[PDB]
């Protein structure tokens, strides 16, 4: 499950939903504790 | 045919960061390890950082700085943090015989070319004695009262060091008369909910300017100029006050 | 906006040892910072301690190095300032506030093969802050 | 762990106790949900 707002650094008409800035929480490297981490996809790559 | 190409190096003042590189070319990067020597003019090779499947420093290190490599480009870094001025040296690459790291010149077998890298700064970007080292005693200065017509823009000036104000962000706390202080600027450029927009403020090197507009019996209250900074203690001053009254 | 109740101060002699204490309520305690600020009677400000959400990091004035004794109590929500080798310059008021960076949680503790449990934090990031936005009434504490 | 109980619609005498009727929590495609799901199991491929 991630948590995706609309990326909107200074964009342009063109690239208005295209990217998504994503954050979910992820494994460290210990099995025992996770940390939220974030990355950028594209729009085509995600869904609701 | 094993060759070994270096980067980084040149001029960085005293305190700065630079990265070192060295990629291997002829040869499988996950068979053999990595390390640094360094050459100060006039002396012999010694030992800096070095990583193969463990990293080894240095007894001069000290911990500035960090060795990693990269098996994506086959390439070993140095970040070099808090640059002294007795580190200035030409810095080799070598390439061990194994997988394992020898503080020894002779546990090597192929070296690069070299890369000169200098620190000259010589104490010109601290030096210290009252400016940046301890700060001294610095105490803020302030207009001991203001006064001007009910509706009429009235400003406080807050000036003090480089180290409290110039450094570092200012906040400015209102005593209203027999109550208790209330915040109003953090960081000169923001405000909380309670507070209108009718207060304003800005800074210019190391004089803090507060700006109010519409003023009001209600504003009637001493105004304080206060900077924090964990880095150093002579930071924490509080500013004398400022009195406010409407005519 | 929250509650800010101060007391435990008195009248007490120069030399002798005192214990103020502040409470919290609608707000998280532990995630907040503690600072002491001293304001004699017609004058300015003056801080004198800040300590950080954990309780490791302790700041101390010039003025009060080597006698003022800062510590919280996360779990009763308290605040305590024992104070040593009291002066009669000490008669003045005392300001109880808190911080406002709002830590977070870094780690939280993870099941592996559910990943959807809401377990309790591991690891947290925080302190320092030393600015003030609510201030409290105050105590008011006598050396005579 | 699987919470079972015998399945009995009319069922003929020589299968009293043949079949289980299993429910046991399972994970989905997303690893932070999960689903609760039942299936049948014979006796002889599950222990108490
Ligand atoms: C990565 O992992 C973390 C922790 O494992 C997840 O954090 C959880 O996020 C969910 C979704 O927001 C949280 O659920 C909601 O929390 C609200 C606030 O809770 C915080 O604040 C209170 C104090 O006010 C703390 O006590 C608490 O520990 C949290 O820090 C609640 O108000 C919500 O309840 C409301 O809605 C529900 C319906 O959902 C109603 O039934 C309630 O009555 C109420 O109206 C809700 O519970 C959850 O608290 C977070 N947990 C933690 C430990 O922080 C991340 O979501 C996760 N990331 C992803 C992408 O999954
Ligand atoms: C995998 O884990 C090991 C073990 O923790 C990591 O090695 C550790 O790396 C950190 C820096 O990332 C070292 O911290 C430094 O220590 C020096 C010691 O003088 C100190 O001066 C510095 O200020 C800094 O704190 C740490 O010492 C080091 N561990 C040991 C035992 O030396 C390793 O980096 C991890 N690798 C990855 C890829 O995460
Ligand atoms: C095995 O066990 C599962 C779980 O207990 C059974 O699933 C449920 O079975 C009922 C009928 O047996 C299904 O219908 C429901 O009946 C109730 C009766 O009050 C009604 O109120 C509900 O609205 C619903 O119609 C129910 O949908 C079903 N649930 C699921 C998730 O499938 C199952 O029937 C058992 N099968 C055997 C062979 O024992
Ligand atoms: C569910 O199946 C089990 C397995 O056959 C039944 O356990 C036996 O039931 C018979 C009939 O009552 C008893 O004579 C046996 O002694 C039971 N075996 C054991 C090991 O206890 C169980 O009775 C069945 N339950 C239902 C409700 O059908
Ligand atoms: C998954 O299995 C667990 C454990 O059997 C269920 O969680 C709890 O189970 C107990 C006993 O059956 C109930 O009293 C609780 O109410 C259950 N918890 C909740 C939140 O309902 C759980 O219901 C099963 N299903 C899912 C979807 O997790
Ligand atoms: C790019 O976005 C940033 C916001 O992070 C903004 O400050 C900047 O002005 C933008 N660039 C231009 C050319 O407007
Ligand atoms: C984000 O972009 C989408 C375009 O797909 C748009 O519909 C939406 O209004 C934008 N804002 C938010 C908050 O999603
Ligand atoms: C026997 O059980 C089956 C189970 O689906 C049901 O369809 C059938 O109607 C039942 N017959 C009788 C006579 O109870």
């Known amino acids: 499950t991630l948590q995706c707002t609309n990326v909107t650094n200074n964009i342009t008409d063109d690239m208005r939903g295209e990217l998504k800035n994503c954050s979910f929480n992820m494994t460290t490297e210990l099995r025992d504790k996770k940390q939220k981490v974030y990355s950028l996809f594209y729009r085509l790559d995600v869904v609701q | 045919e094993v060759q070994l190409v270096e980067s980084g190096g040149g001029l960085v003042q005293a305190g700065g960061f630079l990265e070192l590189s060295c990629e291997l070319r002829?040869?499988?990067?996950?068979?053999?390890?990595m390390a640094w020597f360094r050459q100060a003019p006039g002396k012999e090779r010694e030992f800096v950082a070095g990583?193969?499947?463990?990293?080894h420093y240095g007894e001069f290190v000290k911990g500035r700085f960090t060795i990693s490599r990269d098996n994506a480009k086959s390439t070993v870094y140095l970040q070099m943090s808090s640059l002294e001025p007795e580190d200035t040296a030409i810095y080799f690459c070598?390439?061990?015989?194994?997988?394992?790291?020898?503080?020894?010149?002779?546990?090597?077998?192929?070296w690069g070319q070299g890369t000169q890298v200098t620190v000259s700064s010589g104490g010109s970007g601290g030096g210290g004695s009252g400016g940046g080292g301890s700060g001294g005693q610095s105490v803020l200065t302030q207009p001991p009262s203001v006064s001007a017509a009910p509706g009429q823009k009235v400003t406080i000036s807050c000036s003090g060091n480089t180290s409290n104000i110039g450094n570092n962000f200012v906040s400015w706390y209102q005593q209203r008369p027999g109550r208790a202080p209330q915040l109003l600027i953090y960081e000169t450029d923001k405000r909380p909910s309670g507070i209108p927009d009718r207060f304003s403020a800005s800074k210019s090197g190391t004089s803090g300017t507060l700006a109010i507009t519409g003023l009001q019996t209600g504003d009637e209250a001493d105004y304080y100029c206060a900077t924090w900074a964990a880095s150093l203690s002579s930071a924490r001053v509080f500013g004398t006050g400022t009195q406010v009254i409407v005519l | 906006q929250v509650q800010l109740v101060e007391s435990g101060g008195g009248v007490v002699q120069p030399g002798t040892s005192l214990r103020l204490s502040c409470a919290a309520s609608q707000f998280r305690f532990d995630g907040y910072g503690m600072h002491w600020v001293r304001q004699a009677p017609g004058k300015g400000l003056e801080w004198v301690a800040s300590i950080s959400h954990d309780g490791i990091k302790k700041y101390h004035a010039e003025k009060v190095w080597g006698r003022f004794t800062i510590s919280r109590d996360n779990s009763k929500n308290t605040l305590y300032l024992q104070m040593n080798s009291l002066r009669p310059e000490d008669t003045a008021l005392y300001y109880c506030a808190k911080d406002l960076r709002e830590d977070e949680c870094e780690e939280w503790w993870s099941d592996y093969y559910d990943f959807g449990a809401q377990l309790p934090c591991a690891k947290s990031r925080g302190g320092l802050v030393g600015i003030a936005d609510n201030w409290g009434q105050g105590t008011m504490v006598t050396v005579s | 762990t699987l919470q079972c109980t015998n399945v009995t619609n009319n069922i003929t005498d020589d299968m009293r106790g043949e079949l289980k009727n299993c429910s046991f929590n399972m994970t989905t495609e997303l690893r932070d949900k999960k689903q609760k799901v039942y299936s049948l199991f014979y006796r002889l491929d599950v222990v108490q």
């Open positions: 070598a390439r061990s015989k194994s997988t394992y790291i020898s503080y020894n010149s002779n546990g090597y077998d192929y």
């Open positions: 990583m193969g499947a463990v990293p």
């Open positions: 002829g040869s499988i990067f996950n068979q053999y390890a």
